[PDB]
Design a protein around this ligand. Structure first.
Ligand SMILES: [Cu+2]
Ligand SMILES: [Cu+2]
Length: 573
């Protein structure tokens, strides 16, 4: 954690733009976080970096490898290294939007400051969400804490419930996007499940200064076609083999034997073979579905390379959320997991009820009570480390707090985990969204431990303490819970809502912490990012109580005593 070490790490990712089997991908080219060949070389470099004898040696071969290796590859590999090396514990890694400002700021803005029009598509209304600097940044960091190439034996340690977190992090990005479509009066996103459908287009307007090239645009009307490395009918075959297994209740291992998709580990098993991580039980049979969709959608404009055009924004984790088809593709992937959760039996009163506890009231305090206000806000970005500043505007909300009045009818002190979620009340056509439909649109706002003393209790919690968000990201000139960069953007905690004020259900559930607790640095954004070197500190399935099918029609009829829904309104300006 010495400042000396931080400054040295800070120099490694300064103006970016034994090592035999590294240096296959060219400098200047756009690195793909999803293509198998690209990730294999990324693995080799972070393996060299973790094998390095000490911090003196790690900085040495690293300083050495960046002079000839691709800068995307190097950044990926160097961040996995800083994050997992014991000697690097305490050290931050500098903002990705500062390393490569050209992946977060428009091509025009970069051009308009190098040594110094009107809207025609409704999707532009949602650019505040998809093109947000912090959301794209988070997505980069999330995949580096949880990489698909992670080999648990090599590193001597497991990433707990990584397959289940792949599912949950991506289900939440989709659920949060839909709250933004409905906020803007639009329908919920449809899944790209017929692979013969023509895709809608997107032009990213992002240059790749390192070579004077760009992330290739996608016109409207192209349909997925076979690339040299994969055929589309092979992806249809992977989807069918997975649904098969989901409906049978078991998965077939490489040795031909049957692993069962039980309630404990089934989501994790399935997450490992759908994304396709190293931990997949049978890669030759189930494939690499999620990651091959990213690749075929990213190179759809040049399936076989003859045009020598770079991939689209879908090939990178720092830019894929910008593209509207990211959500179509991930709602299709979320449907695979949703088809599995539906084979699970609805929770019983016993698993939901926390018996002597009764939540009596919930109030959101914020200028006007039970109303949250959002607006746009400017921020600058320093471009001199990856040029000087560039201003942009993002969604932000006003600070708020929750006041939950609990009644502990026990004669002793209980310990509870307060679970807070937010879900829209109506759809864009004024209809009440039924209980089961809410499962797909409920976003996690918080999860924290509280102590309940007998009788009346009033739990106060502040929006800034949210277990979903990153509370701090120090700039490059700052470096010259803690030190990790994963976490949802604070300014994007709740949705935009509209000018009249949109209705949202604020759900609060209190469960028994002595049943949820599992046995720690970087728990700032625990919900979405987990904890460093520790297993996920909640035994309940991610998204509880919304992951299994709810058979009641209205969600208020689903409520037990330890649950409460307060209807609030989010208003924009
Ligand atoms: Cu992702
Ligand atoms: Cu993805």
């Amino acid at each position: 954690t010495l400042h000396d070490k931080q400054i040295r790490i800070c120099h490694l990712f300064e103006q970016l733009s034994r090592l035999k089997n590294v240096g296959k991908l060219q400098p200047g080219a756009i690195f793909s976080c999803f293509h198998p060949d690209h990730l294999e070389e990324a693995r080799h470099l972070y393996e060299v970096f973790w094998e390095a004898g000490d911090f003196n040696d790690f900085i040495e071969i690293a300083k050495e490898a960046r002079t000839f290796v691709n800068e995307g590859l190097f950044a990926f590999a160097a961040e996995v290294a800083v994050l997992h090396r014991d000697d690097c514990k305490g050290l931050y890694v500098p903002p990705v939007q500062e390393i490569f400002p050209d992946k977060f700021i428009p091509s025009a803005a970069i051009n308009e400051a190098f040594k110094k029009g009107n809207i025609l598509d409704p999707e532009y209304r949602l650019a505040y969400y998809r093109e947000d600097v912090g959301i794209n940044a988070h997505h980069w960091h999330w995949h580096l804490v949880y990489p698909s190439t992670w080999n648990p034996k090599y590193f001597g340690k497991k990433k707990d419930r990584k397959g289940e977190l792949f599912y949950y992090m991506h289900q939440q990005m989709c659920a949060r996007y839909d709250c933004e479509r409905l906020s803007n009066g639009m329908h919920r996103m449809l899944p790209f499940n017929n692979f013969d459908e023509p895709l809608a287009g997107y032009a990213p307007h992002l240059t790749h200064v390192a070579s004077g090239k760009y992330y290739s645009p996608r016109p409207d009307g192209l349909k997925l076609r076979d690339l040299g490395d994969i055929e589309i009918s092979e992806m249809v075959r992977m989807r069918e083999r997975i649904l098969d297994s989901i409906h049978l209740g078991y998965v077939i291992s490489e040795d031909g034997s049957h692993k069962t998709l039980d309630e404990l580990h089934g989501t994790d098993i399935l997450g490992a073979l759908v994304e396709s991580s190293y931990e997949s039980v049978n890669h030759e049979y189930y494939g690499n579905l999620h990651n091959w969709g990213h690749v075929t959608m990213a190179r759809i404009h040049d399936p076989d390379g003859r045009f020598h055009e770079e991939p689209g924004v879908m090939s990178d984790t720092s830019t894929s959320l910008r593209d509207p088809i990211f959500y179509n593709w991930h709602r299709f992937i979320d449907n695979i997991f949703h088809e599995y959760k539906n084979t699970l039996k609805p929770y019983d009163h016993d698993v939901l009820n926390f018996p002597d506890i009764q939540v009596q009231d919930v109030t959101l305090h914020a200028r006007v009570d039970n109303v949250v206000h959002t607006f746009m806000r400017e921020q600058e970005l320093e471009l001199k480390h990856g040029s000087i500043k560039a201003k942009y505007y993002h969604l932000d909300h006003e600070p708020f707090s929750y006041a939950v009045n609990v009644q502990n009818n026990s004669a002793s002190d209980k310990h509870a985990t307060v679970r807070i979620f937010l879900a829209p009340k109506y759809d864009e056509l004024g209809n009440e969204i039924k209980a089961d439909e809410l499962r797909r649109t409920a976003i996690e706002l918080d999860k924290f431990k509280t102590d309940l003393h007998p009788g009346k209790n009033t739990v106060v919690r502040h929006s800034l303490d949210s277990s979903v968000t990153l509370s701090h990201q120090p700039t490059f000139e700052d470096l010259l819970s803690e030190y990790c960069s994963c976490g949802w953007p604070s300014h994007l905690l709740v949705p935009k809502g509209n000018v009249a004020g949109m209705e949202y259900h604020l759900f609060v559930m209190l469960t028994d912490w002595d049943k949820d607790k599992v046995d720690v640095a970087c728990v700032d954004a625990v919900s979405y990012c987990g904890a460093r070197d520790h297993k996920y500190p909640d035994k309940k399935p991610m998204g509880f109580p919304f992951d299994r099918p709810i058979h009641t029609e209205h969600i208020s009829d689903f409520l037990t005593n330890n649950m409460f829904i307060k209807d609030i309104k989010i208003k924009f300006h």
